[PDB]
Amino acid sequence: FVEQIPEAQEEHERYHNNWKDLKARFKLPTIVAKAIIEACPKCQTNAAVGTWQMDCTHLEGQVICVAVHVASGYIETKILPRETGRETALFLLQVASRWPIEHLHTDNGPNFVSAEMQATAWWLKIEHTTGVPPQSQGSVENKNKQLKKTIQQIRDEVQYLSTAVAQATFILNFKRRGGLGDMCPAEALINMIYTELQTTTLQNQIHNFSDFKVYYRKGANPLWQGPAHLVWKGEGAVVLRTDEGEVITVPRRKAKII
Amino acid sequence: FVEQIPEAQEEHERYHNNWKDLKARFKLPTIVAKAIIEACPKCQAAVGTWQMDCTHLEGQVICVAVHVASGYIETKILPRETGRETALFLLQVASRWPIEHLHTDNGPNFVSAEMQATAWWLKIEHTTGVPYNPQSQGSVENKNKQLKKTIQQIRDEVQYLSTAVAQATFILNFKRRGGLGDMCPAEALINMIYTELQTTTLQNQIHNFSDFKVYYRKGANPLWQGPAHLVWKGEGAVVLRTDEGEVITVPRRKAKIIK
Amino acid sequence: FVEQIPEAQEEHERYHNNWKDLKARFKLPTIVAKAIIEACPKCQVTNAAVGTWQMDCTHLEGQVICVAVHVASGYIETKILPRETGRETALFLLQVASRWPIEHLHTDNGPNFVSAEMQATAWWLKIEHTTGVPYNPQSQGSVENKNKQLKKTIQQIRDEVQYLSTAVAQATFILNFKRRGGLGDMCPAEALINMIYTELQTTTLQNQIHNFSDFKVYYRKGANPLWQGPAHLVWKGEGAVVLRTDEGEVITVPRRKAKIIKPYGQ
Amino acid sequence: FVEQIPEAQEEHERYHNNWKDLKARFKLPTIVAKAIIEACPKCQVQGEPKTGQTNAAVGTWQMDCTHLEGQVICVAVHVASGYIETKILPRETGRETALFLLQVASRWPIEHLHTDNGPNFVSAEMQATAWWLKIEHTTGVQGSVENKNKQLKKTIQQIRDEVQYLSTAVAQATFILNFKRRGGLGDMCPAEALINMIYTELQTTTLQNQIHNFSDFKVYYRKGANPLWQGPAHLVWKGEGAVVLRTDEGEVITVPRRKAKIIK
Amino acid sequence: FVEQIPEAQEEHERYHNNWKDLKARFKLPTIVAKAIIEACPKCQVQGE
Amino acid sequence: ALINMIYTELQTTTLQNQIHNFSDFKVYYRKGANPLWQGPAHLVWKGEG
RNA sequence: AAAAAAAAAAAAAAAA
RNA sequence: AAAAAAAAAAAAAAAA
RNA sequence: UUUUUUUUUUUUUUUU
RNA sequence: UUUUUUUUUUUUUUUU
Ligand SMILES: [Zn+2]
Ligand SMILES: [Zn+2]
Ligand SMILES: [Zn+2]
Ligand SMILES: [Zn+2]
Ligand SMILES: [Zn+2]
């Protein structure tokens, strides 16, 4: 793939592809594709993976707290013995310990603005905002209505309400598909989390070790060329960008790093 | 699928799946899935689902139709936001790819008589308002945002807006790869269409089973049992449903059909 | 099959199909299908590459109709050009290339097919624009037949449709989806989809191989509790996995003794 | 990295992090991170993990019930990665265990279980829940769940002073163990490891299902002692010592080179 | 002869007729007349 | 005829191997889709499959 | 000896 | 290259 | 006894 | 982890 790099660069300069297509059309590895993408002046946390909305509902005289991911359709439900701030804080702590979370959108209820919730948010380093935000609220209410309908559908076949709530949550999470790629809500969340983690790791790796200066020998030319910014340093080869924007790969034996 | 009919039914007893999910997982015909869901007292992403919406840019109206299950998009610059133009765009889209379901918001142009006439002519199940499917509620908005983002990268080296729109659509459809399979939208759409074509060719449809009565011999009981509705007539065996709500596949030698 | 006789007739009221399509859809015999076709007053009775397309222009009722025809299958696309100019033809070519893979365009030597706009558009998509008499007369004959059939269908449909564009779109829909073709008894759209899917088999295999070259697997061999690896993954099964170690050995490991990880690094 | 030392110290003082986590988070060298963790009254630098037991599957979980401060704590541990799910049961009864299993199975894919012969693990509620979720249940004769319980107890003791109630302490300990504690086999926390395993399983299944009816270089093979040739079958891998084949029926078979013929 | 199919069916359900007679009267082809007699619960295709 | 019958019986008995000694061992079985244990029922034949 | 096309014979499944 | 004998490795089923 | 789907055989013609 | 039945591989020896 040594000679494929100029072709990939010209292809991106023409069509503006993404790295997952460059790494599959020219068979070049992942980090080389990321470096090619990030060398483009136009292409170069999304705050959409860790946004959750919490609400409380009444059913049969009991209180059910539902936390819904804004993206996809993942939900988590718990029957609260008492509508108090301590139980809400405990449920938020459990949700945070189960899945990553960064933001939280709750209403102006007395329990959501209590001191315990603020203490939990401060301990967990969570930005919590209460009030009127957009159109995702409609989807949240739609999810709540769907949960209520599923609860009513199979209520008669069980004795306790907690078992019915758990069954409804399982049905809504793992047994209902639809959307892009035909993925249930329990797989879309995992897909977004994995893609975000991969992007963050690659960006950190590329942009951390970037202040180095590497002199390289290209081809049979014995003269030392450069200086060029170090992109990726490996066991056998290193990829770097020259001041002209060209990204190339040079073996360690032909590269000197300062 | 003799051994698949009972087990699939068991699924509907526990999680209460849908008939589409039954076809997707158990590769069963639509008629038997409909019989299964109908038999349950509680109960009373496809290859042909599209979502159409409009947007404004530089004083020009752009209409975008998006396939929810793959991400394929099609764009057209409408001279005016009228019912006739949108109906013509829908007719043009339906003449290239198979359309069996169209969903759109409650805008005035989507409610006009021209759209209804076109949908009736093309035999399309057109719905408006809140999407019945829980998911796919924001795919079109994300696609519109992506198109608006990519059009700016190309607008600089382009004279006319229509050329920029066409280039952006080409780039989005062919030059970008998705996740969980690593397929661009066009390849995924073509694969889904091919699979559906093979399945429908195998099915051959044309059932017209009506309300033919069936008498069946179950187990070792010699006496006739029933009468029961007819669900599927096959050369090797026949699938039937009883008035109680049980779906049973029996060999032809122990089935008598009365019209 | 008499019960299908009425309904099929109703279909011929809307879409003017041929006897082949009715026979293939409603399972009617050939003679009765031909009789149904004849009963309508307004009715009578190549091996190119996958990415081969042709373009043509026609004049009808003071309007310019641009037709792009697939050569191998017969799938067609039509547009109403406002004014016959190189810019409009280039825009139509760009629009067609944004839906289907185009690799070779055959046109005539007209004035609007040689303008700088057409050359720029063909260079942007990296396609070979050939102008002149086609090498195979069969392709030209098929294109002319497609144009004549489009004109006939437009004439048949125009009586029930007010505007010209709607009639052209309906004729295109009928030609692409309703009337069947020759070998295989498939519609032009179905044949095009099948050909494109068949052509796209090697690329998916190469992509799968390249992606599988990324996963790592840690395996346990024998009764030794210490884990081993990392090794390249060859195949993953429901019961056991097949791996290729760095030394070249091929090892089958039960599923309970194998753990597959795709690292975030590299 | 002089400016990162106070931030790392504050973060460790809030939740006690592993030395590997501090090394891989603030990019500090090993020596300074080890000095930071070592200079803590209730922290050690042991860093001696053990093997991943013997049954390591994606859909295999475990269960246990421990007693602490006169309360019953139910713990479920993912064997392959090390994920921990904890709950406080009002009573050590079968119904509570069934409810907890139903709650756990509603979040992550479960296809197996490994419990002991306790009275609550053989109740009719357990059988009904297992039948409803299509979960295979085994009982009888481990080390992983005991180690996780010991670590959870140690973390609870570490964080018990600050909090007032016990449920909050258990939740905080679970949060610390799941996320803010780096581990081996790729240097990732258990939650990230579990997500990675699930995603790679899904991707492998999808990619394998993408190609099922076409390949290159169909080959003929001889199976067992039967000298009759068989095939043709799709070629998956061609090697110097042996070849890996996939037949039309979906079976994968390894065949020595002397028993395979390649055609083009 | 498509318009004569309902009349032939009505005549057949009034009194049952042989397929040869139906073919001779309404000038239907053999296959369609055989189909008409075919769709009768109390008729056969012996023709002996 | 006697030799043929003896040979067939010898093959059948070699396949059987006898030596059952099943005694009154009790069995709990899961029949159909019912998850609850049913029985108890006497053991008749213990086979690998 | 292998491939393709046309005609003829028999058998199995299905409707009458 | 085929048959026979001895030793070694892995997997499936069964009892603990 | 008639008609559709599948399978197994015979004859003729065109190439290798 | 130990023991029986079956299957798949490696090494050595004796013949063809
Ligand atoms: Zn770019
Ligand atoms: Zn139901
Ligand atoms: Zn007609
Ligand atoms: Zn500490
Ligand atoms: Zn009659």
Pick A197's closest partner by Cβ from C210, C214, C264. C264
d(CA A86, CA C188) in angstroms, rounded, equals: 66
Pick A15's closest partner by Cβ from B136, B171, B178. B171
Residue D108 makes CB contacts below 8 A (sequence gap 6+) with: D78, D83, D194, D198
Residues present in chain F in total: 49
F touches which chains (3+ CB pairs under 8 A)?
D
Cβ–Cβ below 8 Å for A197 and C265: no
Sign (positive/negative) of CA torsion A98, A99, A104, A107? negative
Q: Which phi and psi (to 5°) does residue B63 adopt?
A: -105, 130
**Residues C52, C46 contacting (CB under 8 angstroms):** no
| Burial status of residue C221 (CB atoms within 10 A of its CB: 0-12, 13-18, 19 or more) | exposed
The two beta strands, A127-130 and A103-106, are parallel
Output the CA–CA distances (angstroms, integers) from residue D1 to A205, C206, D4, D35, in the order listed.
17, 45, 5, 15
DSSP-derived 3-state class of residue F40: strand
Cis peptide before C101 (omega within 30 of 0): no
The DSSP line for D33-102 is HHHHHHSSTT-----------S---TT----EEEEETTEEEEEEE-TTT--EEEEEESS--HHHHHHHHH
d(CA A175, CA A165) in angstroms, rounded, equals: 15
d(CA C179, CA C11) in angstroms, rounded, equals: 12
**Residues D148, D176 contacting (CB under 8 angstroms):** no
CB-based contact (8 Å) between A201 and chain C? Answer: yes
Running DSSP on this structure, what letter comes out for residue D253? E
End-to-end CA distance of chain E: 27
Q: Which amino acid is at B115?
A: M
The two beta strands, A51-59 and A103-106, are parallel
The total of other beta-carbon atoms located within 10 Å of residue D80's CB is 23
The total of other beta-carbon atoms located within 10 Å of residue C250's CB is 19
Residue C54 makes CB contacts below 8 A (sequence gap 6+) with: C68, C69, C71, C105, C106, C107, C134, C139, C143
Residue B220 makes CB contacts below 8 A (sequence gap 6+) with: none
Both tokens assigned to A257: 């790093």
Q: Which amino acid is at A21?
A: D
Beta partners for residue C217, in sequence order = C231, C260
Whether the beta carbon of E34 falls within 7 A of nucleic chain I: the reply is: yes
Residue B68 makes CB contacts below 8 A (sequence gap 6+) with: A178, A179, A180, B45, B49, B50, B51, B136, B139
**Residues C244, D240 contacting (CB under 8 angstroms):** no
DSSP-derived 3-state class of residue F14: helix
Whether the beta carbon of E38 falls within 7 A of nucleic chain G: the reply is: yes
CB-based contact (8 Å) between A176 and chain B? Answer: yes
Q: What is the CA radius of gyration of chain B?
A: 24
Sign (positive/negative) of CA torsion B52, B55, B60, B64? negative
| Burial status of residue B212 (CB atoms within 10 A of its CB: 0-12, 13-18, 19 or more) | middle
d(CA A11, CA C179) in angstroms, rounded, equals: 41
Phi-psi sector, A8: left (phi>0), alpha (psi -120 to 50), beta? alpha
Q: What is the CA radius of gyration of chain E?
A: 10
d(CA B251, CA C10) in angstroms, rounded, equals: 37
DSSP-derived 3-state class of residue C71: coil
DSSP-derived 3-state class of residue D197: helix
| Burial status of residue C42 (CB atoms within 10 A of its CB: 0-12, 13-18, 19 or more) | exposed
d(CA A1, CA F37) in angstroms, rounded, equals: 63
Residue spans of alpha helices (H) in chain C: 4-14, 19-26, 30-39, 86-97, 116-124, 137-157, 164-173, 188-199, 201-212
**Which residue out of A125, A163, A187, A211 would a mutagenesis test of the D interface target, given it has the greatest number of D Cβ atoms within 10 Å?**
A163
**After which residues does chain C have a break in its backbone, defined as C to next N over 2.5 Å?**
45
Q: Which amino acid is at B167?
A: Q
d(CA D259, CA B189) in angstroms, rounded, equals: 41
DSSP-derived 3-state class of residue E1: coil
Which long-range CB contacts under 8 A does B192-200 form with residues at least 24 apart?
Answer: B192/B47, B192/B69, B192/B70, B193/B47, B193/B97, B193/B98, B193/C193, B194/C193, B194/C194, B194/C197, B195/B47, B196/B47, B197/C190, B197/C193, B197/C194, B199/B27
Q: Which phi and psi (to 5°) does residue C97 adopt?
A: -70, -15
**Residues B250, B238 contacting (CB under 8 angstroms):** yes
**Residues C35, E2 contacting (CB under 8 angstroms):** yes
Give the CB-side neighbour count of residue B82, counting CA atoms within 13 A.
Answer: 6
**After which residues does chain B have a break in its backbone, defined as C to next N over 2.5 Å?**
44
**Residues D149, D171 contacting (CB under 8 angstroms):** no
**Minimal CA–CA distance to C131: which of C158, C113, C153?**
C113
Q: Where are the beta strands (DSSP E) in B79-172?
A: 101-104, 125-128
Angle at which helices E4-14 and E19-26 cross, to 10° = 140
Both tokens assigned to B24: 């997707």
Beta partners for residue C66, in sequence order = C57, C79
Running DSSP on this structure, what letter comes out for residue E10? H
CB-based contact (8 Å) between E5 and chain C? Answer: yes
The two beta strands, D71-77 and C216-219, are unpaired
**Minimal CA–CA distance to C14: which of B196, B15, B117?**
B117
d(CA C230, CA D28) in angstroms, rounded, equals: 27
Nearest CA in chain D to C252: D254
Give the CB-side neighbour count of residue D93, counting CA atoms within 13 A.
Answer: 6
**How close does chain B come to A15, measured CA to CA in Å?**
6
Sign (positive/negative) of CA torsion D139, D145, D149, D152? negative
Interface of B with D in 80-109 (CB under 8 A): none
- Helix (H), strand (E), coil (C) string for B157-218: CCCCHHHHHHHHHHHHHHCCCCCCCCCCHHHHHHHHHHHHHHHHHHHCCCCCCCCCEEEECC
Resolution in Å, one decimal place: 3.3
Looking up tokens 């080409």 gives B170
DSSP-derived 3-state class of residue F25: coil
Sign (positive/negative) of CA torsion F14, F18, F19, F25? positive
Running DSSP on this structure, what letter comes out for residue C174? I
Running DSSP on this structure, what letter comes out for residue D186? T
Looking up tokens 């592809």 gives A17
**Residues A88, A111 contacting (CB under 8 angstroms):** yes
Residues present in chain B in total: 259
Sign (positive/negative) of CA torsion A101, A107, A110, A113? positive
Q: Which nucleotide is nearest to E38 (CA to C1')?
A: G16
Q: What angle do CA C145, C150, C152 make, to 5 degrees?
A: 95
**Residues D218, D204 contacting (CB under 8 angstroms):** no
Residue C7 makes CB contacts below 8 A (sequence gap 6+) with: C26
Cis peptide before C29 (omega within 30 of 0): no
d(CA A235, CA A252) in angstroms, rounded, equals: 8
**Minimal CA–CA distance to D253: which of D262, D264, D242?**
D242
Q: What is the CA radius of gyration of chain A?
A: 26
CB-based contact (8 Å) between E4 and chain C? Answer: no
**Minimal CA–CA distance to A93: which of A72, A114, A119, A75?**
A119
The total of other beta-carbon atoms located within 10 Å of residue D21's CB is 23
Both tokens assigned to D47: 């860093």
Residue spans of alpha helices (H) in A16-160: 19-25, 30-38, 85-98, 115-124, 136-153
Give strand G nucleotides closer than 7 A to any protein Cβ: 13-16
d(CA B190, CA B195) in angstroms, rounded, equals: 9
Q: Which chain C residues have a beta carbon less than 8 Å from that of B91?
A: 166, 169-170, 173
| Closest-approaching ligand to the CA atom of A41 | 1
C-alpha E13 to ligand 5 mean position (Å): 7
Output the CA–CA distances (angstroms, integers) from residue E23 to A146, E33, E37, in the order listed.
62, 6, 11
**Residues B217, B209 contacting (CB under 8 angstroms):** no
Q: Which phi and psi (to 5°) does residue C175 adopt?
A: -65, -40
End-to-end CA distance of chain B: 26
Interface of D with F in 126-165 (CB under 8 A): 127-128, 130-131
Count each helix (H run) and each strand (E run) in chain C, helices first.
Answer: 9, 10
Q: Which amino acid is at C211?
A: N
Closest residue to I4 (CA, C1′): C27
**Minimal CA–CA distance to B187: which of B99, B72, B101, B100?**
B72
| Burial status of residue F46 (CB atoms within 10 A of its CB: 0-12, 13-18, 19 or more) | exposed
**Residues A98, A170 contacting (CB under 8 angstroms):** no
d(CA B176, CA B71) in angstroms, rounded, equals: 11
Sign (positive/negative) of CA torsion C17, C20, C21, C25? positive
Running DSSP on this structure, what letter comes out for residue C200? T
d(CA B136, CA B37) in angstroms, rounded, equals: 24
**Minimal CA–CA distance to D60: which of C256, F35, C238?**
C256
d(CA C73, CA C82) in angstroms, rounded, equals: 28
Cis peptide before D232 (omega within 30 of 0): yes
Sign (positive/negative) of CA torsion D136, D139, D145, D149? positive
d(CA A184, CA C114) in angstroms, rounded, equals: 52
Distance C98 CA to H3 C1' (A): 67
